[PDB]
Each structure stands twice: as C-alpha cells, then as structure tokens.
Design a protein around this nucleic acid. Sequence first.
DNA 1: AGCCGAGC
DNA 2: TGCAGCTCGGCT
DNA 3: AGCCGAGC
DNA 4: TGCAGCTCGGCT
Lengths: 671, 671
Amino acid sequence: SKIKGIPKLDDANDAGGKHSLECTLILTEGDSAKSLAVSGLGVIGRDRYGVFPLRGKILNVREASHKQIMENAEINNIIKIVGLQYKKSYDDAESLKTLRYGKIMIMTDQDQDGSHIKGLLINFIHHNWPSLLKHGFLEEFITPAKEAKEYFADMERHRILFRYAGPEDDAAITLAFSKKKIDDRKEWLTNFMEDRRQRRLHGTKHLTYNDFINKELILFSNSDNERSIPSLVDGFKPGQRKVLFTCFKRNDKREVKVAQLAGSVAEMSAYHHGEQALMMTIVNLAQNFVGSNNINLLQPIGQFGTRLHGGKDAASPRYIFTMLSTLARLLFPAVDDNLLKFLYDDNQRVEPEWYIPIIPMVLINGAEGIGTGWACKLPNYDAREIVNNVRRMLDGLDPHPMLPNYKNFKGTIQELGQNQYAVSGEIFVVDRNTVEITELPVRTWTQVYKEQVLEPMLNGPALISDYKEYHTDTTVKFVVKMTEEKLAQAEAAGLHKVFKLQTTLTCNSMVLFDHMGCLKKYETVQDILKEFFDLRLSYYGLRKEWLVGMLGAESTKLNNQARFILEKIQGKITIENRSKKDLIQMLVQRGYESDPVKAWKEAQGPDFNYILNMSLWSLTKEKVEELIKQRDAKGREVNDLKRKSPSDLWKEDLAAFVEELDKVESQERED
Amino acid sequence: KGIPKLDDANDAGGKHSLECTLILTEGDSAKSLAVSGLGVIGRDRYGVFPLRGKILNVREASHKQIMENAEINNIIKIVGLQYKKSYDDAESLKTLRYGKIMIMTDQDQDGSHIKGLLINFIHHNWPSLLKHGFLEEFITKEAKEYFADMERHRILFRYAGPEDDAAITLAFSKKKIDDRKEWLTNFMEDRRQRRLHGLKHLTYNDFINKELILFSNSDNERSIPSLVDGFKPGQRKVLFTCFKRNDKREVKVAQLAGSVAEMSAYHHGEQALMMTIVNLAQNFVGSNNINLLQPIGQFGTRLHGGKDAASPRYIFTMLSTLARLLFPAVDDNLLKFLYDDNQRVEPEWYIPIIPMVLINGAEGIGTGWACKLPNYDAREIVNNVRRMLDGLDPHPMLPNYKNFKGTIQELGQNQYAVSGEIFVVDRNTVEITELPVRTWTQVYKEQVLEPMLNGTDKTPALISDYKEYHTDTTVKFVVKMTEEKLAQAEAAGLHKVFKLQTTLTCNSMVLFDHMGCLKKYETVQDILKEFFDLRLSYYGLRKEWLVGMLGAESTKLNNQARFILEKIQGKITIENRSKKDLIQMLVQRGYESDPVKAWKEAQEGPDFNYILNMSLWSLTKEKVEELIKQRDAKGREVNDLKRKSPSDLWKEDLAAFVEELDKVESQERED
DNA sequence: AGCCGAGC
DNA sequence: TGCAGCTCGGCT
DNA sequence: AGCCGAGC
DNA sequence: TGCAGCTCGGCT
Ligand SMILES: COc1cc([C@@H]2c3cc4c(cc3[C@@H](O[C@@H]3O[C@@H]5CO[C@@H](C)O[C@H]5[C@H](O)[C@H]3O)[C@H]3COC(=O)[C@H]23)OCO4)cc(OC)c1O
Ligand SMILES: COc1cc([C@@H]2c3cc4c(cc3[C@@H](O[C@@H]3O[C@@H]5CO[C@@H](C)O[C@H]5[C@H](O)[C@H]3O)[C@H]3COC(=O)[C@H]23)OCO4)cc(OC)c1O
Ligand SMILES: [Mg+2]
Ligand SMILES: [Mg+2]
Ligand SMILES: [Mg+2]
Ligand SMILES: [Mg+2]
Ligand SMILES: [Mg+2]
Ligand SMILES: [Mg+2]
C-alpha cells in the first residue's frame, strides 16, 4: 500500500510493506519543523522514517461531534498514513499487520504549546485505540540544520518512549482532555498553583502518561491561564501589556504599521510567540466600533473592522497603522512607572507585572479570556460613571451600583438580577406594513442579523414581505415590510421578541488574577472596584513618597548648582587651571554635595559632574537669573506636594482624564 | 455562478445584460471599495470581480497557458464571451451577460500596465467588441463619494482606426521588441529635453503612448541597474536605510523592510522589498561574490538556488563589515540625495571604491531592454583599478564566481563555456564534484541523474547507481556505470553527456550611466573605464570636501583654545555679563562665528555657541591641556590630508578593503 | 520550456 | 496577497 | 452548534 | 503559516 493524495507527507520507503512495524511516522509541529527532520534524517533515514507536519493544535476528538471528526482533514490524513481503522482493536500481534507504521514519534517545540500538542495526539490515540498504547505506540523526539543532522545521529539520546502503566494513565489523560472534567481541572490547577507558591516561600528513557500529564502538560495548562486570564489591576493580559509597555517606550508621535509595531514589541519585550497573534492583539486593542472598546488605548488608523462583521473585516496588519490614544498616558501616568515592578527576561528588563491605571480598566473594555479550568468574562462599563464612583469612595461615600454600558449603543441594558442583564436593540412601528430597526443588541453584528434573522423571515413560513438596508459604517437601519395581519400578530407578540432584538448577558465567571498574582473569582464588579480602589489609593501614597524624595533631591541639586554659580560670578570660588583632584577636594571642603539626585536613586568618590558639566553660558546674566527662578520653583514644587494628600493627587489625575475624554469623544462624533 | 470572488450584477444574464457593467478591480481590497461604493442600488447594473495583479499576455502565449489560465477563464465565464466568435452585428451581442467592462486599478504605473493587459486581451480575441465601446475605466466611505459622482470618474476607451491597432501591438507583441526600444528611446530623449527646458474619451493610441509608456519607462528605471553602484533603486533604498540605521545587532528581514519603506519612501508592496533584501544577503555559490548584507538564518542554498529560503519574518540580517569599506561614509557628503514629498531619501547613486556592478552580476528585465552581467573577481578588479591609477591598461577579465571550482573559458566575444567537474575514479565509477554555475544540486539530481538512472519514455538509462555526499555548500555525486557505458560516455565527452557544461552569453549589458541615460556596453572594460573616471574625480571632490571641513574644524578648535586660554588668564570674563554684551565683546576681540556651521552653509547673527556651550570642566587643568592637544592634532590632520592625492586616498581605501576581505573570507572558510 | 527578479 | 483548521470555558 | 481571543 | 498566478528580454 502507498499514500497518493497527501502532498505534505514524506512516506518511509518501507511503510506499508513487510517491515511496516519497524517504520516510524514522525509528526512535527509545523512545516518548518518537518524540513529540519527531513534534513536530519538524510538519505539513510528515508527508509524507516516517515515525516508529516501538523498545523498546530489537533482536534480534541474526545466528545467532538461525529461530523467535526469525520471532516477533520488532519486526523483523516494521520489515519490514512498509518492505516488505522476506527473501532478496530489492536491487541493481537496479528491485528498489527494491517498498519503501515509501527509507531508514531511526536516532534514539537520543547515549550508549553508543544506539550499541548503532544497531549492532544496522545488523547487522539487513547480515545480511539487504547489497545495501541499498551504496545508502546507513541514516542517523542526532544530538542533543546547541521544541528539537525547531529540530533538525528544521536537519536537514541533524544528519543523518549511513552509508557502505559495502569488506570492512573487513563485517569490523567481524561482529566486533561474530557469536557466532563472541568471541575477536576480547576482542582488540579488549584493544587499546582498552591504547591508552587509554597515552593517559592522556600526553595528515564520512558515516561508514563500520568507523569507526562501531571508534570509536563500541567505547565501548559497553567501558562494558558497566565496568558489568557486578565489582571484585575490593569485589565491586561501579558501580551496586551507588552504591547502597551512598548508603545510607551517608543512614544510614537506619528502612526506606525501594525506589523512593524508587532516586530518592535517582540524585540523590546521578549514576547516569545508568533508575531501574527501579537498583530491580532494590537488590532483588538485599537477597535472602536459598537460593542468593542469603550476606551481604545491604541488608535485604529485604517480599516480595523466594523460592526458589520464584528471586526472580522479588518484589513491586513501590513496595511494598517496605529499609535497611542492621547488618553493612554492620562490613564497610565508615566510618573507611576517608577512604582512598578518591571520583569526580566534573560537579563533584559521588559514589561511590569502590572500597570496601575487611575481607574479600573478591567471594567472599561470588558476583560475576556479562555484558559484551562477557568475562563473570564466581564462586560464594558461607563468610564464617567466609574470616575464618579471613585470620587464618591474618595469622599467616604458609598459607590452607586453600576450597570454595563457600551459606548455608542443606542439600545437598552436592564438588570434582571445579580450579574444578569437583558440587552435590547431598537425596533419601532412606522405605519401599518412597516417596522424600522435602528439598533441591534450589543455584539450582534449587522451582516449576521441580516443572514440569520431577516433572510429566514423573508424566505424559508415567511413572516415579512421585504426589507431594505440603510446602514452606515457605525449605525444600523433596517426597514421591514409586512402585511397588517402579520405585523399585528408580530406586534401582539413582542416585536423585540419576534425580531430577535433581545439577548441575555450573564456574568458568573469574573475570574481575574489579583495584585499578588493569585487567581480569584469575583462575585460582583463592586468587589472588583473596591479591591482596585484600595490598591490604587495605596499607590498614590507611594507616588507621593516617591515624588517628595525625588523633587527634594532635585531641589538640593539646584541649590548646589545655584550656590556654585553665585559664588563663581562673585569671585568667591575659581576653578580656572585647577587640577581635577584639587577641584574635587575643594568642593568637598566647602560643603558642596555629591550629585543629590544620583545619591537618592541609589539609596532606593563624590560626584560634582552635575555642577561642572554646566555650560559657560551658565555664568552669564540671563542664565543666572533663570537658574535662581528654577531653583525657587523646585522648592515651591516640593512644598506644594508635601501639603497634598494622595486623594488630592488622584483627583487631579481624574480631572485631567475627564477633560481629554470629553475632547476626544466630541471630536469623534464630529468625524 | 460557482465563482467565489464574483459579486454578479443582479440583472447579469437577463434581458438587461448589455446595460450591465462588470467592474474588474486591482486585487480583492479594491473590490471591497467598489462593492461598498455601489451601495444597494448599484448591485443591479454593476458586477465586481477582482484581478490578482498582472494578467496573462495572451497575444503570443501558448494554447496550454491560455487554456489553463484560471483568471482569464473566470472573466470569460462571467462576461459570457466565447473564443473565435465575432461580435459585429446586434444579434451576436445577445449572448453576453455584461455589455461593458469597467477597469478599476490604482492610479499608478502598474495599474496602467494592467489596463493595458486587459485591453490587449480583448483586442486580441475580440477586436470587434472594441469598435462598439466595450471597455472603460474608473479613475480615482470615500468610495460611495466616487460612485455618486460616477460620470466624472468614468473614462471610455475609443477605437479610432489602425493606429489604435499598431499601438496595442507595439506594446504587447513579442515581435515588436525593437519597436519598443525605439518607442522608449524617443520617450527618454524627449523627456530629457524638457528637463532642460520646461514641463471623456481616450483612444487606445493615446492610452498606450501617453499612459502605458510611463509604466514601460518606470519598469526600466526599477529593473535596470546603474553602472555607478550596481544597484536598482529598491536595492539602493535598502542600503541607504541600513547605513542610516547603523544596526550593531541583527534585525528581522520583515522589520528591516518596514523600516526601509518609511525611511526611504518606497512606494511598493513590502513583500517585494523583503525578497530584495534576501537576494542582497545570499552567499551561496552562484549568488553574490560579495554580499553586502549578512544572511543570519536560512536565506537559501545552492541545493535549491535559494528557493529554500525561510520566511522573511523568521530570518535576520545586518550590514557586512565590507559594506562601509566599499561605500565609505565620508563620500555620502558628495552624493545627490533625492527628495520624495519633502522627505530626503536615498541618493541617485552611491559611488563605491570599485565597480560593484561587476562584482555581483547586475541583472534585470525591463521593457525594451534587459540587463545581464556575470560575476567578476573582487581582487582582480582591485588590481585592475590599481593598474589604471598607475596609468597602465587594465588586463582583460573573465567572469569569476566565488567558491566556484570549475572553469570558465572564453569562446568568443561575450561568450563563455562554464564547466563543472567530473572525473573517472575506476572503470565503473565517476565522481562529480562541481556543477556549472547556476545549476542547482536538487535540479541537477532530478533532471539529469534520475533520468540517467531510470531511463525515460524517450531516453535509455546510462548509469546503474548514484550516491550523494553533499554539504550545504558543496557538491559530491558518486556514480556507478558498467564498463561499456562509461567507455561510451568518455568517447562522447563526460562533461557533455553529464550536462556539466553550459554557455554564458552576455550581449545585453545594458545599464544607466552616471547621467541616468540608458546605455549598452560591449565589454566590461568599457564599464570599468567609465566607472574609473567617475570614481577618480569623486576622490578629488572628497579631498576638496575634507580640506574645507578639517580646515573649519581647525579654526573652531583654534577659537575654543583661545577663549579658554584668555579666560584662565583673566584676559576675559563672562561672569554676570548679559548675552548681548558678551556677544559684542567676542566680536570685538575677533573671535570667529562658528566656522564649521559657516562652512557647511557655504556649501549651498554671530554664532558663539560652540564656545559658550563648552562645560565648566573646560576651564580646568587637564581639560585645558587636552584641548591644546586636540587643537594641535587637528592642525596636523589638515596637513596630513593635504599631502595626500586623490589617488593616495583611493589606494588607502583599497588596502583597507582587501585586508577585511581576506579576514572575512578566511573566517567563512573556517565556519 | 523555463530561469532570472522587481513588481502586481 | 488572501485564505483556512484547531484549543480552552461559559453561555446560548 | 458557535462566539469570544491568545495561542499553535 | 505556507501556498500559488502573472510581466518583461535574452538566452538555455
Ligand atoms: C499553513 O501552515 C501552517 C499553519 C499553522 C496555523 C494554521 C492552520 C490552519 C489554518 C490557518 C492557520 C494560521 O492561523 C491563522 O493565522 C492568521 C494570521 O493572521 C491573522 C490576521 O488571522 C489569523 C488566523 O486567525 C489564523 O487562523 C497559522 C498562523 O500561525 C499558526 O500557527 C497557524 O487553516 C487551515 O489550518 C501552523 C503551522 O505550524 C505550526 C503551519 O506550518
Ligand atoms: C491573493 O490575493 C491577491 C494576490 C496578488 C499576487 C499573487 C497572485 C497569485 C498567486 C500569488 C500572488 C502573490 O505573489 C507571491 O507573493 C509572494 C510573497 O512573498 C514572497 C516571499 O514570495 C512572493 C511570490 O513570489 C509571489 O508569487 C501576491 C503578493 O503581492 C501580489 O500582488 C501577488 O498565486 C495565484 O495567483 C495580487 C492581488 O491584488 C493586487 C491580490 O488581491
Ligand atoms: Mg513554540
Ligand atoms: Mg474587548
Ligand atoms: Mg499600486
Ligand atoms: Mg545576481
Ligand atoms: Mg467547546
Ligand atoms: Mg517569455
């Protein structure tokens, strides 16, 4: 037997023949990895090794529908290449004779997503052919072009065999991959996170499936949560946060191509994944159509998608541009950068563990994510209402309950009960024969509504006679015709009901990482707001301590510079033709201070560079007066700050933000 | 019907067919601007279909290429055209689903080329359709605005006589190459003159001679290299951008490309740029004798002639250390940098120290002409340049490829035999250790050894076996044959039989000279001499620039030293003097306005900042002494430069280049 | 017939 | 240049 | 039966 | 992420 219709397969010369069972099918993570293996095998490896590339994550066939399984081209390819048959039991040494290959060797990246793929392959064989695992059907090739040929020459040092030991192997695989084991996964990961936390307060040719799952795959599952579930503090996940950290660093005064920014992010922040995911993240951060961001931190310069297709109509990231919103640094003040804990990736300082915005951004743009064991979903809330709640809390008052609010949505959102809402579009009777639809419930896209609601009403029993569209890019308007009879009935029943203009929004999975990096479930947004509030208030306290110290050091620095300049122009000191050593010694003796700002930073020989690096211009009339004013202004600045409370600082930030939010949003409505 | 990318006009195929217009767009994106421009009402009388760029030139293409052309067939099916059918009368026009084709392309030169190719397609198969006025064009949210003003954007092509036939024919027939040379020669000549002086319906004749010809000429300007630096403009923009960036570590190719686009105003798809970057860095046998960019990653190999290069998003590059040795930074001061919309971009040409056009085999295809030069040896060219500097005639040069192990022998003027290497080991064995330049290993294996081993339907087998022992950069086949077959092959000529000899003919050495005029060179000696005269004269300009600049730097340091000496002696004070008083005083003591700034201004109030910006450290002992040394050294440097001739400067550059070339190449042999 | 490479 | 598979959980 | 989005 | 059509001239 040969394999005819699979272009990407390199079949082993002896596959399907008499030495079938001695043949190994290598499944690789992607086409590039195939090339490395095909090269490392050389001509001599072509005899007993086949190579076939997987395109990333494999269908989880456990509990997948029959249709999705039968139609899955990748699984069907593997089945064809190996000679497998659904429902066949491979116990006999004779039942094996119908196979073209005797084993599959999995070859992925030695990273967490690689482990996920190994597990999905294991899951696939385990679900359909458990018997196969008893014969040691599965193996893996671990790594850290010339290096390729080397790895393969030493293949038996890179080759690990999966081993089925008992029913605990079955339980582990099922735990990882069964849709019925979600709760077990929550417990599984809770134990893992707790145990690792404890370890931090202090300090085989063969591998069972139980150990692979519990010691290797679990690392992917945990990383999946870390990358997919947002922080309560800034509302970001790590990829989004790396994007903002990079934009803040670059400080672009003009638009940058999305693909170019993504390349720049990967470099500046040690992002370790495919840049195409990064580009999608960037697009998602810039979107501003109804039902996306309430405050987009990046500007969508170009086609970033519309409500017609829910953003699926975004242009390629090579053709669109972005830059920071003017609101971004008002929300994430640069001064607070000094208070953050910046992370390190291999000696390089990259993004902070979290930013600390002036309002809970996790509520503003609708934190959303799917991990393992847990997922997160929050709706959007109104920025002004949140600012008003923070002010109330600053004044010792109680915050008003908040309803979800989406920018530019003309519809209605009603609270049914805790974390349960009815979201309604807008429909109104014009005359008999005519209704008009001018808003769709949030996250209902215009093209989808037309196709799934209006078309079926018009065609396959038909309820309406006709409809017409008068949409713009940002608005919806359908005019629908029907007989009085039908309209009267439609109207008898609820119009919003018949035209499917009501959806429910339920939020019982507000799961976020707290400020300590612990995953937590929040019951109400008021709980989220309060936890954010206490942390942010504490950080305005830190900001004030930081500023008083730094501005104090700056004041001392200017006092010393000014003293030196006044003494120079009066003849009280001279430096002309003095040696460096003597000038230092002299300055010390006369009580000048080693760089005060440098000393302060370090505290978080003497250095008189800050004095002697001043230009000769400094000795002239206008510059002397200027220096005296700067020195007195700095003194007043520190004094003014000492008098203020952290609450006052927060209130200043909120006022500046609202002012610009007003300008920006008015301007958007003109445009 | 059954054609995915087509948005058929509702009335297409009905009784209103001839009143329908099919809009053919330049790519899928353009199709969308059109679809949203027609609004709802437009869908009735307008279809939209996207072209994937350049259309097949059908005028003399083979029947197979035409029959198998997917996009041509789709257009034919959509419009309802039929080969060979005449459309003279009114009855014939009745089988058409559309009455008009409206072409909508970019308003640029490549857009004109596509209009031209579409016109060519219809004119060739159905010239009867053109005398009716079948073809028209649409010239260019904002989309809806163009389509409501449809008539101001709609231009109709007009067939007006045999001169329309000749023009279409001139442009697109394989038989009219010579006419195109003359056609463009006249255009270049005429445009050249106005350069000294100054500054609805459309016939096919006016379209071809007024619009298409601008593409034909632009095609030459981007495809045919300059004699001076061996670059086309895209390549030149790339190097200009690398020089400006001065990267000290590797940069992703995709990212470099994005950086070139913005820094140099490259107005084409970045994917083209990424391929240019890859081609500039390649260093396998038969590519570049000197790669100006380093290939960090998989940039392709001789196995597949570079077709095996990985994606530009996964590979990195940076300047070769040879780059600024060949294109010295000092010479940038002599170039003519171009402007694109107020941004200064790359120069008309760089002026390297040897004729790079000969080193890397400048090569391209335009309209009317094409260019092909083979590679020449860098050291041999350096030697020839040194001979010319001594007033001697350069020796003739044969093409020479780095790391090529075979032979290249002249057969006639501009004609060479290039031979690989094959030798008889024993009476059953031959060994092939080199393939002729540009014969790739995998292609040789598939097209020569495989057929020799297996025979074909049309040829017998010659060999009994072969084995491969290649490395990434070398070739080694060991071939088995019967004694009888080998004797036969020897008698016929082993190199001939084994396809290890090819011809290299160079009768199309067409380049732009230093004035930007297209020229045909008969010998490389003529290229070398023209280059030499220009480069020598630019060494003269460089000396004149260096004497002026160093002179100014000397004057600057003289004034700084003087002021510092007069200060530390009490001869002058600035302490507490106003700006005006101090400037007036410096004038009256005869201090010079910034001499370097004054000199740079001359190359196209009093400024004493270069003095008064000096730090206070300047007045101290060790800095006084250091300044006096700098001053005296600058003076020595001016006179050192003044006793060097242009020829001396050139020889210094040549020596520095050869030293690094030896180092670089011997390091390459190690690795 | 199809390569070469800067473009669509 | 544009096109397409999948995972994971909550929700519908 | 499928969205949401950071990933392969 | 990887895959594929075409132009244009000189030559194999
Ligand atoms: C073909 O060769 C390989 C493909 C892959 C997958 C993949 C697999 C697909 C498939 C598409 C994709 C594709 O994802 C699409 O990318 C798009 C990128 O731009 C944005 C705008 O939109 C994204 C799509 O949302 C995503 O669906 C790949 C990008 O990065 C990957 O890892 C993806 O449709 C068919 O099956 C992995 C490999 O080895 C690891 C391969 O060798
Ligand atoms: C599908 O949508 C459109 C496609 C196009 C063509 C195109 C057309 C093709 C085809 C491929 C291509 C492709 O060229 C390939 O690109 C590759 C890009 O990376 C490098 C490494 O290697 C390049 C290939 O050498 C080139 O062959 C396009 C890239 O830029 C273009 O203009 C190309 O195979 C089938 O037909 C134009 C449009 O509107 C103007 C479209 O809407
Ligand atoms: Mg990986
Ligand atoms: Mg969102
Ligand atoms: Mg264009
Ligand atoms: Mg070349
Ligand atoms: Mg699911
Ligand atoms: Mg041709």
